[PDB]
Design a binder for this molecule. Structure first.
Ligand SMILES: CC(C)CCC[C@@H](C)[C@H]1CC[C@H]2[C@@H]3CC=C4C[C@@H](OC(=O)CCC(=O)O)CC[C@]4(C)[C@H]3CC[C@]12C
Ligand SMILES: CC(C)CCC[C@@H](C)[C@H]1CC[C@H]2[C@@H]3CC=C4C[C@@H](OC(=O)CCC(=O)O)CC[C@]4(C)[C@H]3CC[C@]12C
Ligand SMILES: CC(C)CCC[C@@H](C)[C@H]1CC[C@H]2[C@@H]3CC=C4C[C@@H](OC(=O)CCC(=O)O)CC[C@]4(C)[C@H]3CC[C@]12C
Ligand SMILES: CC(C)CCC[C@@H](C)[C@H]1CC[C@H]2[C@@H]3CC=C4C[C@@H](OC(=O)CCC(=O)O)CC[C@]4(C)[C@H]3CC[C@]12C
Ligand SMILES: CC(C)CCC[C@@H](C)[C@H]1CC[C@H]2[C@@H]3CC=C4C[C@@H](OC(=O)CCC(=O)O)CC[C@]4(C)[C@H]3CC[C@]12C
Ligand SMILES: CC(C)CCC[C@@H](C)[C@H]1CC[C@H]2[C@@H]3CC=C4C[C@@H](OC(=O)CCC(=O)O)CC[C@]4(C)[C@H]3CC[C@]12C
Ligand SMILES: CC(C)CCC[C@@H](C)[C@H]1CC[C@H]2[C@@H]3CC=C4C[C@@H](OC(=O)CCC(=O)O)CC[C@]4(C)[C@H]3CC[C@]12C
Ligand SMILES: CC(C)CCC[C@@H](C)[C@H]1CC[C@H]2[C@@H]3CC=C4C[C@@H](OC(=O)CCC(=O)O)CC[C@]4(C)[C@H]3CC[C@]12C
Ligand SMILES: CC(C)CCC[C@@H](C)[C@H]1CC[C@H]2[C@@H]3CC=C4C[C@@H](OC(=O)CCC(=O)O)CC[C@]4(C)[C@H]3CC[C@]12C
Ligand SMILES: *[C@@H]1O[C@H](CO)[C@@H](O[C@@H]2O[C@H](CO)[C@@H](O)[C@H](O)[C@H]2NC(C)=O)[C@H](O)[C@H]1NC(C)=O
Ligand SMILES: *[C@@H]1O[C@H](CO)[C@@H](O)[C@H](O)[C@H]1NC(C)=O
Length: 842
């Protein structure tokens, strides 16, 4: 312990040196990272929710690169000839309206005058005059066509002068007369405006303005948010615009300013606890420098080219965690002052470094275990947050004690009395009433296990939408109110299976960014023209005709080629189905040419693919399409059954094939299903890794076995109760939720670690004295840490984005649950049956 004495002497005797050096280095790294790496573009929020590296992901990447290589460039070419030498539509912007006093049908006069007022309110907005999409060049901003407008249109007069009880009732008699006289397009248009349940009492109406859906009309959206259109009787409840991602970005960038408020509150907490402004200032600086160093190591050093939006969530975490190691430090420091600076620094560092290290290690280990996932955004988030935590810990060790020593170089009643009363009440409660808390929190643990595991588990998302905004946001309300209207159904597109042979199922790209798919490799053992290959391809088609999932051209080209052979002469003419391979390769491109030269020209993925090696071409690949009876569903079990069945049958069929064609693989629109499977598997893996990290850290630092078991129990019950609370709040499995379930461990184990470490650290080995010592020393820092984290999240609750709200719920829930379990369940366990006299000590 001689070298560490020198480090403590440096921190105590020359702190300005460490401060200046850290500041210079971190500011330089920030300068480099922000100047050299161009800034993150969140133009598309659903970027990196794909599972690169898996079987399905490999196949999908290969299939994508194939289409990327079909026609625009590359030796491949589908056709060898290319190788040789007014009424509305959905794209307009539309508002969905409902009536909210009487709450009767919208249709009658009062609703129509309300919609007149709505239209006059919308069109009075200034920017609308620029976006109006004027037509006819008559110096007119064209009017929005809706219910009252059409009611006036059937009449000769204009709108808002309806005289409805004779006029609107005539419009009613018109609609009841006809169903699907067709004056201009009134019936068809108006039956597309209103909902299914119009035949009387349309639950919802819709207003169409002459404005295309674009990314440009965001100030229009904000101007409409100013005047909320709720005037007396009607409510604009779902305004669809092609504006989800732009508003998502803008709201992220505003809600980080809102994160600044939680940062301010955490700084206020540090000021109240410590009693100086210098330490809170330098802790803010430490949080910022940790973020900067992490962004530098992420972008510049590690060359991670993709920065998700989820990485910003790490900021919301670290403002909670970064100040925590402050509260633990100065406490011990003040204790050492009660019982020059070099010795004090040595003692408080020997007492605090274990706990600080342990907390940051558990959090960073969970975050880095998130890198085990196949999804890319999870990998990026894991690496970023782990780097942020590790930077925060190094910043703690170096920059915090120097700031402490500088504070002492620089150098309340109600606060002390309140903290004393709080400590006294908590201590007396735990010591007197222990079995009560043990029973209560064990019951809650069992209930939460039943909730999280058996019946209402973390069910997968089945109507995904990759939701972004709050449920009571118009862009998200509209997605629920789509199906009620007519022009939202295309009936359903059946799924179409592809079988590909020429190319390998490999992803030779960087799995971290979604814009490096790599280069496809062609299988060189691939020979279609062989006679056994012809026989097997024919039997394959005719076998697909047998199987149940089949549903009924370019696909199964071999049939069209046999037809091209069947035609009598007057080379390719007057042949049979089994014929010579050079005749095959010479006549097949001619068959495709004559089939495309037909005026049908069915453009599809199906067919063979040729390359230059008339000149003799060679087939590098083919894809065989078949329409399947299964419809495109979002749920997991249907596509699981479909994919498993078809893959099993195909892999059984391939064994019949020669070794030439034994390189084929299956594909469909299996992106979301692949995500769904990998998400559960990777969540389990990340939970296992983080749990192992926490268990190891426990066994090393709180060397006793019983304390480790009690801590594992407390953490497991805390995570159970948290996940259960989230489920009852309406949480389903998703990327953020898998992340949060993996990181709840490393967030929650901190409190248990503090208590177990200080319990081992007690001089008196009796459980009673050890518990008193533990509580008296460490009750305050845990409280202020949990408070800072929960407060940082609970301000994010006041946001319109779902990620930030979800983090608010998660941080608040985890911190409160973990504190109440570790403080009452674990300490009661130690008070009643804790280890004394070194029982079960390593
Ligand atoms: C930049 C990041 C990696 C954080 C680490 C900070 C280092 C740059 C600090 C930590 C220990 C510091 C050293 C601790 C003490 C000394 C002894 C000192 O020697 C003297 O005796 C001059 C003063 C005198 O004699 O009064 C020269 C600087 C040096 C090596 C300091 C140089 C800078 C060091 C390596
Ligand atoms: C330590 C924690 C609190 C993270 C805070 C990081 C800040 C340095 C970032 C967060 C949001 C950023 C702002 C988000 C967007 C803009 C608009 C930008 O001007 C533009 O018109 C182009 C960008 C756009 O319009 O999206 C000028 C800087 C500014 C205010 C950025 C300034 C720096 C801010 C405050
Ligand atoms: C001050 C210390 C704690 C450093 C903290 C890092 C932040 C200053 C960085 C991290 C990610 C950066 C963002 C990643 C990039 C964007 C998008 C950009 O908006 C645009 O759409 C313009 C670019 C384009 O459209 O081409 C506005 C800045 C912003 C939010 C950057 C603002 C500053 C952020 C929050
Ligand atoms: C430094 C502190 C925070 C402790 C944590 C160390 C991490 C850097 C370790 C812990 C678990 C390690 C992971 C455990 C296993 C895997 C899977 C591996 O991918 C594979 O698919 C091949 C191995 C397999 O069969 O799983 C990639 C590395 C990775 C994530 C390891 C990367 C580094 C991790 C995140
Ligand atoms: C939220 C649920 C899961 C339990 C945790 C909430 C605590 C703030 C409560 C629970 C029981 C409360 C205790 C129940 C009764 C008393 C006796 C009381 O004794 C007195 O000296 C004055 C009043 C009296 O008891 O006569 C001191 C506070 C205390 C231990 C209370 C302190 C705060 C406790 C630990
Ligand atoms: C072991 C089991 C019984 C877990 C017990 C934990 C309780 C403290 C949780 C379980 C369900 C939670 C409730 C679930 C949902 C809500 C609604 C919430 O108000 C809202 O309007 C927002 C809800 C949303 O939008 O999802 C107020 C809190 C409350 C009652 C929560 C309060 C705390 C409750 C009772
Ligand atoms: C202490 C030992 C004896 C274990 C006791 C376990 C009970 C506390 C479990 C068993 C059946 C459970 C219930 C089974 C299922 C439901 C439905 C559930 O309703 C919902 O719709 C919430 C889901 C959502 O909104 O996402 C509310 C919880 C509840 C009654 C569970 C509450 C807790 C119960 C009573
Ligand atoms: C004891 C420690 C762990 C702190 C946790 C206390 C919670 C009960 C507090 C913390 C912040 C509070 C939140 C801060 C502000 C808001 C916004 C409020 O709704 C608004 O949108 C009004 C503000 C706006 O204009 O956006 C709903 C309650 C809520 C989430 C509060 C609910 C309760 C929260 C989560
Ligand atoms: C170990 C035992 C004592 C568990 C107790 C934990 C509570 C402090 C947690 C459980 C559920 C939490 C609540 C879950 C969510 C809500 C709703 C939130 O307001 C919202 O509108 C969010 C809903 C949305 O925007 O979608 C205000 C905070 C609150 C009551 C949270 C406050 C703190 C609660 C009551
Ligand atoms: C696929 O395999 C067949 C036989 O295994 C190859 O056919 C022969 O080689 C040349 C090709 O022009 C010709 O002599 C005959 O067509 C075949 N040889 C015989 C019958 O002895 C065929 O070339 C292979 N495909 C490719 C693209 O090379
Ligand atoms: C105007 O009124 C006449 C007489 O009822 C009717 O035939 C005509 O269709 C009306 N005009 C419009 C645009 O509906």
């Amino acid at each position: 312990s001689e070298r560490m004495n020198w480090y403590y002497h440096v921190l105590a005797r020359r702190p300005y040196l460490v401060v200046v050096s850290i500041a210079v280095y971190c500011v330089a790294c920030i300068i480099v990272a922000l100047v050299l790496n161009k800034l993150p573009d969140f133009s598309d929020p659903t970027l990196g929710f794909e599972t690169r590296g898996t079987k399905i992901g490999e196949r999908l990447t290969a299939w994508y690169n194939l289409l990327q290589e079909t026609d625009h460039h590359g030796a491949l070419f589908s056709n060898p000839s290319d190788l040789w030498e007014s009424s509305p539509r959905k794209e307009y912007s539309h508002f969905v309206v409902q009536r909210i006093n009487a709450t009767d049908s919208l249709f009658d006069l009062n609703g129509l005058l309300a919609m007149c007022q709505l239209q006059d309110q919308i069109t009075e907005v200034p920017s609308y005059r620029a976006f109006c999409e004027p037509e006819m060049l008559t110096t007119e901003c064209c009017r929005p066509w809706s219910l009252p407008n059409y009611a006036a249109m059937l009449a000769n007069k204009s709108s808002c002068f309806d005289l409805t009880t004779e006029d609107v009732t005539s419009l009613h008699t018109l609609l009841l007369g006809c169903y699907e006289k067709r004056l201009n397009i009134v019936f068809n248009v108006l039956n597309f405006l209103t909902d299914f349940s119009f035949i009387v009492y349309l639950k919802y109406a819709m207003i169409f303005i002459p404005v295309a859906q674009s990314n440009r009309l965001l100030p229009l959206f904000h101007e409409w948010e100013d005047v909320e259109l709720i005037n007396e009787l009607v409510e604009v409840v779902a305004m669809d615009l092609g504006l989800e991602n732009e508003l998502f970005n803008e709201l992220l960038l505003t809600d980080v300013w809102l994160v600044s408020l939680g940062g301010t509150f955490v700084m206020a907490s540090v000021w109240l606890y410590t009693g100086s402004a210098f330490i809170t200032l330098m802790s803010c600086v430490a949080i910022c420098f940790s973020l900067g160093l992490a962004y530098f190591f992420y972008a510049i050093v590690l060359e991670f080219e993709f920065f998700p939006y989820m990485n910003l969530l790490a900021v919301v975490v670290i403002i909670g965690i970064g100040a925590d190691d402050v509260f633990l430090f100065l406490k011990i420091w003040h204790c050492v002052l009660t019982e020059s600076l070099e010795n004090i620094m040595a003692l408080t560092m020997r007492h605090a470094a274990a706990s600080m290290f342990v907390t940051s290690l558990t959090t960073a280990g969970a975050f880095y275990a998130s890198y085990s996932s196949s999804i890319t955004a999870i990998k990026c988030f894991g690496i970023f947050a782990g780097t942020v935590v590790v930077t925060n810990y190094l910043l703690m060790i170096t920059w915090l004690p120097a700031s402490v020593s500088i504070m002492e170089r620089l150098f309340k009643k109600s606060i002390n009395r309140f903290c004393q009363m709080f400590e006294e009440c908590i201590t007396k409660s735990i010591m007197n009433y222990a079995y009560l808390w043990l029973l209560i929190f064990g019951a809650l643990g069992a209930s939460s296990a039943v909730i999280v595991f058996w019946y209402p588990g973390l069910q997968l998302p089945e109507k995904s939408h990759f939701q972004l905004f709050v449920s009571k946001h118009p862009f998200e309300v509209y997605s629920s109110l789509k199906q009620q209207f007519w022009f939202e159904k295309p009936y359903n597109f059946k799924m179409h299976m592809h079988f590909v042979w020429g190319v390998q199922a490999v992803d030779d790209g960087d799995y971290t960014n979604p814009n490096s798919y790599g280069h496809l490799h062609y299988d060189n053992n691939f020979n279609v023209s062989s006679r056994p290959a012809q026989l097997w391809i024919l039997d394959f088609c005719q076998s697909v005709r047998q199987q149940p999932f089949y549903k009924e051209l370019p696909n199964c080209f071999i049939e069209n080629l046999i037809d091209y052979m069947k035609r009598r002469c007057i080379p390719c003419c007057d042949a049979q189905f089994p014929f010579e391979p050079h005749i095959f390769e010479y006549c097949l491109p001619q068959s495709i040419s004559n089939m495309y030269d037909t005026t049908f020209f069915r453009p599809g993925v199906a067919g063979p693919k040729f390359a230059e090696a008339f000149t003799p071409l060679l087939v590098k690949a083919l894809v065989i399409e078949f329409e399947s009876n299964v419809a495109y569903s979002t749920i997991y079990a249907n596509i699981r059954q479909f994919y498993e069945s078809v893959e099993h049958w195909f892999q059984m069929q391939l064994k019949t094939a020669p070794p030439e064609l034994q390189g084929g693989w299956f594909t469909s629109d299996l992106k979301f299903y692949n995500v769904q499977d990998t998400l559960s598997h990777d969540t389990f893996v990340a939970i296992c890794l983080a749990m192992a990290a926490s268990l190891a850290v426990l066994l090393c630092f709180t060397v006793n076995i019983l304390i480790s078991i009690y801590a594992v129990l407390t953490v497991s019950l805390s995570i159970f109760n948290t996940v259960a609370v989230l489920i009852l709040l309406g949480w389903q499995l998703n990327i953020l939720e898998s992340i949060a379930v993996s990181t709840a461990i490393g967030l929650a184990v901190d409190f248990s670690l503090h208590y177990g470490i200080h319990y081992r650290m007690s001089p008196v080995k009796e459980r009673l004295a050890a518990t008193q010592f533990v509580l008296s020393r460490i009750i305050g820092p845990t409280v202020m840490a949990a408070t800072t984290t929960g407060l940082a999240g609970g301000i994010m609750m006041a946001s319109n984005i779902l990620p930030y709200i979800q983090i608010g719920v998660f941080l608040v829930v985890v911190m409160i649950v973990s504190w109440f379990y570790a403080t009452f369940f674990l300490m009661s366990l130690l008070r009643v049956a804790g280890p004394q006299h070194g029982f079960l000590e390593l």
